[PDB]
Amino acid sequence: IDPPALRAAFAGPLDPQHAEVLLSRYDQHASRLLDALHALYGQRADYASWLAQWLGEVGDIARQRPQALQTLDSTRHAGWFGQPHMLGYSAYADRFAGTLQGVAERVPYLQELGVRYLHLLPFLRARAGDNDGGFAVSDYGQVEPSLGSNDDLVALTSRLREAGISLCADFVLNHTADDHAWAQAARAGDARYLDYYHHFADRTVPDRYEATLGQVGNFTWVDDTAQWMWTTFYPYQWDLNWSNPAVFGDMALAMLRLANLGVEAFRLDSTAYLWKRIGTDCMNQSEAHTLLVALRAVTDIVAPAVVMKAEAIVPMTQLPPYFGSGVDEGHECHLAYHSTLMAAGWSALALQRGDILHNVIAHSPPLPRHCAWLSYVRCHDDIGWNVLQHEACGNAAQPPFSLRDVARFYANAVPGSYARGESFGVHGTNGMAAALAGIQAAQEAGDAAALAVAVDRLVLLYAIALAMPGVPLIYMGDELAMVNDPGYRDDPHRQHEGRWLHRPAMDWQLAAQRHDAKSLSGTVYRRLRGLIRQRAALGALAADQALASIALNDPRVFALTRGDSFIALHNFSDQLLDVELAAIGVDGWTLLSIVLPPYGVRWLQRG
Ligand SMILES: OC[C@H]1O[C@H](O)[C@H](O)[C@@H](O)[C@@H]1O
């Protein structure tokens, strides 16, 4: 290639008053971007022409980045998202406040809770009719009309930015809705856009792939195109063909346009399936990581204030690659979801076994520089127990455990369970944190004692997430202990999707009740706030500080350490017990032997 010609193509559209800083970043990161793209598309005859054209488009979008954001790009330090004050919140814009303008007016609520990172679930234009809660995207560059306009998105991010909140948006880059403009153009016979997807005339090629592919069929017959379209998920979601550079180019531009609208974090959905190769399982392929490296390089150049987050619900042993492998470590995703920890938390609770958490943390891969975890208790999906398959087999320190038993416990399919979840290998579990922790059952039985204990269980699980390196993510309503919403059952087109059980509309009346320390919502809210408050004052919890676990011979306890000055002790049983200091080498001070009441948690500055 001809580097100067490529650099010139990029520099062209830039504003001479902002060319210097941008070009400086281009000079240090462009080579990595080019190596990645060459590895993926370099053999194409159209490569050089496509590249020169795309870089020009990239430069033009770079120029359009609002000054306030360009300033953010220049002042924000790497690793910012892993600082102690970072606290996350995940919610649907419509369920939270109806529309984007509604969300903006509720920012004070988010500020009071200490939120500094807001994940709004799919808010871009989605497929007409069924669209899987917005995950079948029809336009990556426009907000769903029922939620507002792009102007409202800009007004929202500006307002959030003022309150010190970073917006995370989903970027469903593996597939689009089958009514996306590219899909419609394909349906109309435009070969150019038909090639943006994986299409086949007969089952000839599809079968070869199927031979090695795994069930999530993987193809859906479409009459309008008269071909089998690759559809890893719902039949109305067509997998994009990332082997086509035009697809990479247009999706990178879409990402940047979203960043220019104020999006600071990207949840990269279904990245494991980005690359297709016959003979393989077409999952977690080397090329998929190369795509993410290329996308990361683009942000490093154009919008370095932004972070890339891997949405790959897999065992923590398959997560390191997302932070970049080998020479590219630190040059891919900044964040990854610690699903193993999440599932382990619930398993440990149900089984009253802290040794399961010791196992998870003791084996948690150390975070690469400027990388961190997203820790959570619940989310918009069912709890996927299968991620714990490996841990469930046990090891030298932790005896095996039954994921089937854990799932049955939470589905209240076994006698003495306090859980009120619903079953969705081992089937996942739907239900809200308060419903799974025993709060719902205690309220339905008017049992005041069982309720207080249930509150302890809920707080315990969040305390664990809050002590982790990265961003602890609260699922909307957990801070008020909201329970299940069975309303979808009595609904037209929703009774088929069991996950709505844990996708309630925000209860603002309940939200106002947080000012009442004697109420349930207020009690939960107050205890979570206390943990958030303490977390923010502990430099030892920053993402660049070590994470480890001290092995204890009492299986009911879990000791998590951060750096060399912080220790968090947890009692996962319903019994009062104690931890001998001479077992964790301590004698420090208590934050906000050691006796732990049932389901108790204690934070200590061992130094
Ligand atoms: O493919 C569709 C799926 O994509 C992601 O996994 C979303 O988290 C999930 O809610 C959705 O159903």
Residue 146: strand pairing partners? none
Q: Does residue 233 have its Cβ closer than 6 Å to ligand 1?
A: yes
Q: Please state, as a whole number, how many other Cβ atoms lie within 10 Å of the Cβ of residue 573.
A: 21
- Please state the atom number of ligand 1 nearest to the C-alpha of residue 237: 1
- Collapsing DSSP to helix, strand or coil, 597 comes out as coil
DSSP 3-state of 88:
strand
Give the contacts of 534 (CB within 8 A, at least 6 positions apart).
Answer: 591, 592, 603
Q: What is the resolution of this structure in A?
A: 1.8
List the determination method. X-ray
Burial grade of 220 (CB within 10 A; 0-12, 13-18, 19 or more) = middle
| 3-state SS assignment for residue 423 | strand
The token pair at 55 is: 């870089």
Catalytic residue among 94, 152, 269, 479: 269
Residue with tokens 């080579």: 31
**Which of the listed residues 92, 132, 339, 496 should we mutate to test ligand 1's pocket, taking the one with most ligand atoms within 8 A of CB?**
132
CATH 3.40.50.2020 matches 1-85: no
How many CB atoms lie under 10 A from the CB of residue 497? 16
Task: Give the contacts of 153 (CB within 8 A, at least 6 positions apart).
Answer: 100, 123, 143, 261, 262
Q: How many CA atoms lie within 13 A of 169 on its CB side?
A: 29
Residues 6+ apart with CB under 8 A from 490: none
Q: How far apart are CA 569 and CA 577, in angstroms?
A: 11
Residue with CA closest to ligand 1 atom 4: 135
DSSP states of 215-227? ----EEEETTTTE
The CB of 381 under 6 Å from ligand 1? The reply is: yes
C-alpha distance from residue 479 to each of 459, 527, 578 (Å)? 9, 9, 28
**Contact at 8 Å (CB) between 531 and 541?**
no
Active site residue 456: no
DSSP string over 146-161: TT--HHHHHHHHHHHH
Judge if the beta carbon of residue 479 lies within 6 A of ligand 1. Answer: no
| Side chain identity, residue 227 | Q
Q: For a pocket test of ligand 1, which of 267, 268, 381, 473 has the largest count of ligand atoms closer than 8 A to its C-beta?
A: 381
Please say whether the structural domain 546-607 has been given the CATH code 3.90.1150.10: no
- Helix 403-410 to helix 339-351 angle (10° resolution) is 80
Region label for 79, one of left (φ > 0), alpha (ψ between -120 and 50) or beta (otherwise): left
Q: How far is the CA of 62 from the centre of ligand 1 (A)?
A: 30
| Contact predicate 293/331, CB 8 Å | yes
The domains of the chain are located at 1-85, 87-174+242-545, 175-241, 546-607
Q: Which residues on neighbouring strands pair with residue 124, listed in sequence order?
A: 143
Q: Which two tokens stand for residue 310?
A: 């891997």
Structure tokens at 295: 């996308």
CATH superfamily of 87-174+242-545: Glycosidases (3.20.20.80)
CA geometry: angle at 310 spanning 138 and 51, to 5°? Answer: 65
Within its chain, how far is the Cα of 173 from the centroid? Answer: 14
| Helix ranges (DSSP H) in 80-143 | 93-97, 100-105, 107-113
Tokens (6 digits) for 534: 């303490």
**The ligand 1 atom nearest the CA atom of 172:** 4
Q: Which of 152, 178, 311, 355 is catalytic?
A: 311
Rounded Cα gap, residues 600 and 579, in angstroms: 12
Ligand 1 centre to CA of 384 (Å) is: 12
Output the six-digit token pair for 422: 């619903």
Residues near 585 by beta carbon (within 8 Å), at least 6 away in sequence: 606
Residues 6+ apart with CB under 8 A from 207: none
Mutate to test the pocket of ligand 1, among 95, 131, 178, 233 (most ligand atoms within 8 A of CB): 233
- Cα 503 to Cα 223, 338, 378, distances in angstroms: 35, 21, 11
Computed on alpha carbons and rounded to an integer, the radius of gyration of the chain in Å comes to 24
Question: Based on the number of CB atoms within 10 Å of its own CB, is 352 exposed (0-12), middle (13-18) or buried (19 or more)?
Answer: middle
Q: Is residue 132 within 6 Å of ligand 1 at its C-beta? A: yes
Atom 10 in ligand 1: which residue has the minimum CA distance? 381
Please tell me the distance from the alpha carbon of residue 567 to that of residue 548, in angstroms, as a whole number: 10
Domains 87-174+242-545 and 175-241 share a fold: no
Nearest Cα to Cα of residue 382 among 232, 483, 498: 498
* Close Cβ partners of 11 (under 8 Å, ≥ 6 residues apart): 19, 23, 26, 59
DSSP letter string over 131-149? -TTTTSBS-TTSB-TTT--
Rounded Cα gap, residues 474 and 471, in angstroms: 10
Using the mean position of ligand 1's atoms as its centre, give its distance from the Cα of residue 513 in Å: 33
Q: Which residues pair with 589 in a beta bridge?
A: 605
CATH 3.90.400.10 fits 175-241, yes or no: yes
Nearest to 485 by CA among 470, 472, 495: 495
Q: Which phi and psi angles does 467 have, rounded to 5°?
A: -90, -5
DSSP 279-331: TS-SSS-HHHHHHHHHHHHHHHHH-TT-EEEEE--S-GGGSGGGG--GGGTTS
The whole-angstrom separation of Cα 440 and Cα 421 is: 10
Q: Looking at this protein, which amino acid is placed at residue 2?
A: D
Q: Report yes or no: 461 and 600 within 8 Å, Cβ to Cβ.
A: no
Catalytic, 311? Answer yes
Hey, which residues does 170 pair with through a beta bridge? 267
Cβ contact 495:487 at 8 Å = no
Q: At 489, phi and psi to the nearest 5? A: -60, -45
CB-based contacts of 446: which residues, under 8 Å, 6+ apart? Answer: none
Strands of 566-571's sheet in order across: 547-550, 557-562, 566-571, 601-605, 589-590
